[PDB]
Amino acid sequence: MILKTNLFGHTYQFKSITDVLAKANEEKSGDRLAGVAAESAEERVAAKVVLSKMTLGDLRNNPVVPYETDEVTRIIQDQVNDRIHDSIKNWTVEELREWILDHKTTDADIKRVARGLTSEIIAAVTKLMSNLDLIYGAKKIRVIAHANTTIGLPGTFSARLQPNHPTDDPDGILASLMEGLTYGIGDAVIGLNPVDDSTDSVVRLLNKFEEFRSKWDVPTQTCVLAHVKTQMEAMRRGAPTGLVFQSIAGSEKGNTAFGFDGATIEEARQLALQSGAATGPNVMYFETGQGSFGVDQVTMEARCYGFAKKFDPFLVNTVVGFYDSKQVIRAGLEDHFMGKLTGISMGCDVCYTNHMADQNDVENLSVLLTAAGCNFIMGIPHGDDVMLNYQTTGYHETATLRELFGLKPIKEFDQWMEKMGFSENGKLTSRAGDASIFL
Amino acid sequence: MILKTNGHTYQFKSITDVLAKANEEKSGDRLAGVAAESAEERVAAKVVLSKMTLGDLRNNPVVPYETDEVTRIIQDQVNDRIHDSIKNWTVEELREWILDHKTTDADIKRVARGLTSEIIAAVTKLMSNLDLIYGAKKIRVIAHANTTIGLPGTFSARLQPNHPTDDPDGILASLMEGLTYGIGDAVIGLNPVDDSTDSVVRLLNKFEEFRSKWDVPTQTCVLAHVKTQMEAMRRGAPTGLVFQSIAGSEKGNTAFGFDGATIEEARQLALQSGAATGPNVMYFETGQFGVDQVTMEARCYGFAKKFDPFLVNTVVGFIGPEYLYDSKQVIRAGLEDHFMGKLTGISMGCDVCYTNHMKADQNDVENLSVLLTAAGCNFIMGIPHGDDVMLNYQTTGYHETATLRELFGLKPIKEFDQWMEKMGFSENGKLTSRAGDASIFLK
Amino acid sequence: MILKTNLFGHTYQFKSITDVLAKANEEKSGDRLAGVAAESAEERVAAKVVLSKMTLGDLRNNPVVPYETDEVTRIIQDQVNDRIHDSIKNWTVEELREWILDHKTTDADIKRVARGLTSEIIAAVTKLMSNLDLIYGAKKIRVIAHANTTIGLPGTFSARLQPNPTDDPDGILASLMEGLTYGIGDAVIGLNPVDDSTDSVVRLLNKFEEFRSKWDVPTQTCVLAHVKTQMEAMRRGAPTGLVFQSIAGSEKGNTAFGFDGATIEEARQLALQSGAATGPNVMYFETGQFGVDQVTMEARCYGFAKKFDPFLVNTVVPEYLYDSKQVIRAGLEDHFMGKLTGISMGCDVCYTNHMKADQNDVENLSVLLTAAGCNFIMGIPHGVMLNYQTTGYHETATLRELFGLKPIKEFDQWMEKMGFSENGKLTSRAGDASIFL
């Protein structure tokens, strides 16, 4: 294959596909720090030109971590329909891009072609797309999934309810939960990322979370975001969970560092279907984000999505961190699109402190992702002040974002809200922020 | 009025100072020395500005009524009765109220009668980007030249080819291409290289022949000096609109070569012998001593409101010192400008400048354009800049505008949309295979 | 410009444009009494023929009252866009008529042509239109205005609440409340006071606004005194939504009414600076019937009114009636010319139940006007205690229901918040002013 372009008055040769994929990315902090980024704006345009002419055959057959060496590569590659791929193998990345964006190409068509794609291809096409392409292209693509209720339907926008609190103090958590419900937060999931993630603490929390949900008959899913194996361990001890969560990576090496493999995730899925509190079939909740190999962040993100797709998740959130702020927006839009095209329920967690990284930047991305058909987004505030983080909730801003686009919580949760008097025809009432009805 | 606040006593030198230090970090303000010394100070300025009554800002324009015509024009638009009823409202209260569910667009428009540009700038300074999006969406503003711009479910765009030499065939090509993507429903014009009265005249008649040839429901304009256009008009050359770059101070306007009385003359002249049905025939361009960029921006709208324009485009740019600049500021200013203008009651758009060497330099423009379109902005245009004058002419933005419309399900102005369908360029809002194909014009 | 024609059997020559305008009108009482009418039905057809072939430029250039002499002609003529007018100057009156009434011709088109028209052209085209043309032709045209709320939107029908004895407070008050329960007063809540002294107007405005604010009624208030009286009342701090003045089609008429162009504009700006309406449309004008005919004079009031972008423009319309049809004809003409001029056109109908008009005639004209797209109509009984109680509230309500119209949006929302109506239909609380007292 070529890997060389003369544009303009200078021949640029690239070492490999991995090199071309990496240098074809827009400016990214992590790639720069790893030495894989483009040495100039001109070299980056060259990478993009080279990539645009690369065929889907070449990319599919040369995954950036070999098949014999990496389980994630095998999981990704084993999902391909070889017959479908064979008919698109001679298409170029740029032809794939144009085809995906064309008027006459439908969500159904795209899902058919997805069967002939791999994470490296998804990754590749994303790099040749503009921010408006990533938005318009992702909107075209519908992805839905069902645990207790169905996420992803047009006209809806969902939100995870996960109170912080440094101590995980029962009162502070409960208070944040109830307030959150009044704003319509918690239809995607109701949960906690616990400080004490011992098997017994997870057992205690899961039990408490289902007691609360069952009390108020909230149509949603519960999930304690500890290690996959700890949640499984709690579930074998009789604790109910709606979803099973795990942070994931784009390599076998990466997942091993996190403490699991495909078999482990598959065992958790079968255990949740057998004994979980959710109807199913979508019971996994995965977290990605870069990173923790010579391969770029975008391509490795794609590969996480390809791993995730194998286990039919209810949710798959990336984590982007708010050097120009435009990078974070770009990342969020890329993630969201690669994931929608991969066919997974994709969301996005946006971290912030305040460093030209503020709440305004988070809002910029949020609005952009919502125009893209992203069904769940959540700001994650950081800072030395652990109490402004707990109190900075994003509940009111999410209600606002919904109203702006005219979206509602998942159908059954929106019905629950009207029965509680917290909302009416999508818009919140005077009871918003008023958790009195619970007490 | 109190200009102090707290575990540290912060104090400000004036209203002009608080307005300035209350802003979000901006390089133009920072380089002009007016910005805040820290985030703690910024938060402090916002707190002081938030407890300030509307009467205090109404009575304390950042440029004196005695001195400056812009200040008078702003202040003379106020209804003293309505202002009186709200004079004791605090700035934070005005923000809350604007954003509240029970508060409607007609309510806002009423309260705007008792407001001034300094107050409009004051409230904007206390709003997050989401507030500026959601709050501007609430506000509808329409204007009618030959057609009505501003209606919900629509999005309009200027057709303004930037050929380096103003080659008649380079323009004719770009114009016809644009029309096939549905561009030019807001206005068909040129910012010409030769802005001489005889040039402007030649241009105005050429554009008019072309528009009239294809019976294109829109307006024409040549973005020159208001005085150049008037001469051209007095010689018998037709114009849909009359353009003028404006400023937020008499000095600024005087520097630009005109005053309030020049714009009224231009306006009444357009109503007398212009090619637009009217009443809205003015087309202003805004964009940025001791007064911050936002407050000055507000004051241009306050100026422009008096002349009921068809369009008022701010100009923001993804160009800058590189080390002191961040894209967020360009986004924030666009969102701010749009809100303030909509709150002022003017048909408000936004021109976005960018260093155009890569296709990825447009990502920044697209970010803002999507945020603004979600806020109800009915017209946005990209302006390519850089040493490559011919790429700038090729970087047309037509396809990207058509895609922006389909993303939100918007169409061009009603009559133009009807023209598009009669020409075969679109159907129920979406373009056809004919998009880009100038053949129907040549055949 | 020919002014002769052979009305097949005789040759009729006319003195001037003024003469031909006048003779083309159908039989009108004032025009007859003034000696400007046609001597025979045959010379009226001849008048029309001549008018029909007359070009628009000729009409624009020759106003019935000279530009050098008359303010109203200048106010009218200075509003013309010469450029637009130049394109149509060779159109005839008949041709202009045809064009208004064409399927393919839109409200937007008509608004562009209006800019090249004048009151004498508006008058002329109307003189050649049938009653259906005036109804249909006007239906096509939408005119909206905004003071506190917006009058003129389609699907709405607005009404004035202006209590008619000795300026009795107990009886004015009771009339307001009873009026609001039927949904009267979305256009404006006013009063034509017997005592039109500045002091009296100031007392009235303060009480009207006190009441309106108390009940939070979304509408405009206005005391129908002299413009200069209202202006002084405003300078003393009295709040008014609209500013009222009867106006005429000549500088002599306005001068006789006691005001001029600068007075009206001084009033307009005053309302904008300290009125209680949001605006921009704050003026409320009354019109209605030299050697110039009634109709052409009417058209000229509208052109005058237009320069001041009024919220409302009511025209007023029994012993000298050759037939009641003339009242119906007058109203349809007035509405068309007002809509063609681009003004919020309303209509006040007078009746004394005479053999030729008569409450049933005020219904004929009302239903006809409502089909015409008229958004404001009011009945005015003449000849004291049976005229205050002769209300028109129930008739107004039944008219809306007949056409499926509602009051102005905000006022309609207030009607439902008050339990007086539901979806434009009144409830059992209609007439029952208990919610107030």
User: What is the resolution of the experimental data for this entry, in Å?
Assistant: 2.2
Q: Would you call B196 an interface residue with chain A, using a CB distance cutoff of 8 Å?
A: no
Total Cβ atoms within 10 A of residue A274: 9
Q: Would you call B85 an interface residue with chain A, using a CB distance cutoff of 8 Å?
A: no
**A161 - beta bridge partners?**
A190
Q: Which helix (H) or strand (E) holds B303?
A: helix B293-305
Give the span between the Cα atoms of B2 and C78, in whole angstroms. 52
**Best residue of C77, C79, C80, C81 to probe chain B, by most B CBs closer than 10 Å:** C81
- Tell me the CA end-to-end span of chain A in Å, nearest whole number: 68
Contact C5, C12 (CB under 8 A): yes
Total Cβ atoms within 10 A of residue B344: 26
Asked if C274's CB is within 8 angstroms of B80's CB, the reply is yes
Give the span between the Cα atoms of B65 and B60, in whole angstroms. 9
Closest to A276 measured CA to CA, from A316, A238, A227: A238
List, in order, residues 6 or more apart from B231 with CB less than 8 Å away: B197, B200
Q: Which CATH number fits domain B53-139: 1.10.220.70, 3.40.50.720, 1.10.630.10, 2.60.40.420?
A: 1.10.220.70
Asked if B81's CB is within 8 angstroms of C274's CB, the reply is yes
Grouping H, G, I as helix, E, B as strand and the rest as coil, residue B321 is coil
User: CA A173 → CA A162, A219, A225, A354, B140, distances in Å?
Assistant: 9, 19, 15, 25, 42
Asked if A103's CB is within 8 angstroms of B328's CB, the reply is no
Beta strands in C278-362 (DSSP E): 283-287, 312-316, 345-351
Read off the tokens for C386: 């049976």
Total Cβ atoms within 10 A of residue C250: 21
Asked if C111's CB is within 8 angstroms of B81's CB, the reply is no
C in contact with A (at least 3 C-beta pairs within 8 A) = no
Q: Would you call C309 an interface residue with chain B, using a CB distance cutoff of 8 Å?
A: no
Q: Which helix (H) or strand (E) holds C378?
A: strand C377-381
User: CA C234 → CA B334, C223, C243, C334, distances in Å?
Assistant: 41, 11, 10, 31
Contact A245, A285 (CB under 8 A): yes
List, in order, residues 6 or more apart from C60 with CB less than 8 Å away: C77, C80, C85, C89, C116, C117, C118, C120, C121
Contact B17, B23 (CB under 8 A): no
Contact B329, B25 (CB under 8 A): yes
Give the span between the Cα atoms of A37 and A30, in whole angstroms. 9
Give the span between the Cα atoms of B401 and B381, in whole angstroms. 9
Architecture of domain A142-439: Alpha-Beta Barrel (3.20)
Q: Would you call B442 an interface residue with chain A, using a CB distance cutoff of 8 Å?
A: no
Q: After which residues is chain B broken (C to N over 2.5 A)?
A: 6, 288
List, in order, residues 6 or more apart from B320 with CB less than 8 Å away: B27
Closest chain A residue to B363 measured between Cα atoms? A131
Tokens 């997805």 identify what position?
A114
Q: Would you call A427 an interface residue with chain B, using a CB distance cutoff of 8 Å?
A: yes
Residue type, B441: F
Contact C139, B301 (CB under 8 A): no
Asked if B25's CB is within 8 angstroms of A131's CB, the reply is no
- Tell me the CA end-to-end span of chain C in Å, nearest whole number: 67
Q: Smallest CA–CA separation between C426 and chain B, in Å?
A: 25
Asked if B134's CB is within 8 angstroms of A26's CB, the reply is no
Asked if C149's CB is within 8 angstroms of B277's CB, the reply is no
Q: Smallest CA–CA separation between A371 and chain B, in Å?
A: 8
Cis omega before residue A8 (within 30°)? yes
According to CATH, the topology of domain B140-443 is TIM Barrel (3.20.20)
Cis omega before residue C338 (within 30°)? no
Give the span between the Cα atoms of A70 and A81, in whole angstroms. 20
**C284 - beta bridge partners?**
C244, C312
- Half-sphere exposure of residue C191, counting CA atoms within 13 Å on the CB side? 29
Partners of residue B399 in chain A, C-beta under 8 Å: none
**H helix intervals, A117-157:** 119-127, 131-139
Closest to C288 measured CA to CA, from C301, C305, C278, C279: C301
As a 3-state breakdown, chain C gives helix, strand, coil percent values, each rounded to 5, of 50, 15, 40
Taking the CA atoms of residue A99, residue A105, residue A108 and residue A113 in that order, the dihedral angle to the nearest 10 degrees is -20
List, in order, residues 6 or more apart from C415 with CB less than 8 Å away: C183, C407, C421
Closest to B353 measured CA to CA, from B339, B373, B333: B333
Grouping H, G, I as helix, E, B as strand and the rest as coil, residue B324 is coil
Partners of residue A131 in chain B, C-beta under 8 Å: 362-363, 366-367, 370
Total Cβ atoms within 10 A of residue A256: 12
Read off the tokens for B366: 């697209």
Contact C22, C35 (CB under 8 A): no
Contact B390, B170 (CB under 8 A): no
**B317 - beta bridge partners?**
B353
Give the span between the Cα atoms of B340 and B317, in whole angstroms. 18
Q: Would you call A198 an interface residue with chain B, using a CB distance cutoff of 8 Å?
A: no
User: CA A262 → CA A244, A255, A311, A400, C431, distances in Å?
Assistant: 14, 9, 9, 39, 77
Q: Would you call A45 an interface residue with chain B, using a CB distance cutoff of 8 Å?
A: yes
- How many residues are given for chain C? 437
Closest to A417 measured CA to CA, from A148, A280, A217, A241: A217
Technique of determination: X-ray
C398 φ/ψ angles, rounded to the nearest 5 degrees: -75, -30
According to CATH, the topology of domain B2-51 is Ribosomal Protein L24e; Chain: T; (2.30.170)
Contact B232, B200 (CB under 8 A): yes
DSSP A228-253: HHHHHHHHHTT---S-EEEE--SSHH
Residue type, C3: L
**H helix intervals, B68-182:** 69-75, 80-86, 91-99, 105-113, 117-125, 129-137, 168-181
**Best residue of B273, B281, B418 to probe chain C, by most C CBs closer than 10 Å:** B273
Which sequence spans correspond to the domains of chain A?
A: 2-53, 55-141, 142-439
According to CATH, the topology of domain A2-53 is Ribosomal Protein L24e; Chain: T; (2.30.170)
- How many residues are given for chain B? 443
Architecture of domain C142-437: Alpha-Beta Barrel (3.20)
| Contacts of B among chains (3+ CB pairs under 8 A) | A, C
Buried b / exposed e over A70-107, threshold 16 CB at 10 Å, is bbbbbbbbebbeeeebeebbebbbbbbbebbeeeeeee
Give the span between the Cα atoms of A262 and A276, in whole angstroms. 19
Buried b / exposed e over A192-210, threshold 16 CB at 10 Å, is bbbeebebebbbbbbbbbb
Partners of residue B106 in chain C, C-beta under 8 Å: 149, 278, 410
**Best residue of A48, A49, A129, A131 to probe chain B, by most B CBs closer than 10 Å:** A131
Partners of residue B272 in chain C, C-beta under 8 Å: 78, 80-82
Q: Which helix (H) or strand (E) holds B15?
A: helix B15-22
Q: Which of C115, C149, C274 is closest, CB to CB, to B277?
A: C115
CATH class of C55-141: mainly alpha
Q: Would you call B326 an interface residue with chain A, using a CB distance cutoff of 8 Å?
A: yes
Give the span between the Cα atoms of B294 and B288, in whole angstroms. 8
Contact C161, C176 (CB under 8 A): yes
List, in order, residues 6 or more apart from B293 with CB less than 8 Å away: B23, B26, B28, B29, B333
| Contacts of A among chains (3+ CB pairs under 8 A) | B
Cα A280 to chain centroid distance, Å, stands at 19
Q: Which of B78, B79, B273 is closest, CB to CB, to C83?
A: B273
Helical axes A228-236 vs A262-275, angle rounded to 10°:
30
Q: Smallest CA–CA separation between B321 and chain A, in Å?
A: 13
As a 3-state breakdown, chain B gives helix, strand, coil percent values, each rounded to 5, of 50, 15, 35
Partners of residue B362 in chain A, C-beta under 8 Å: 130-132
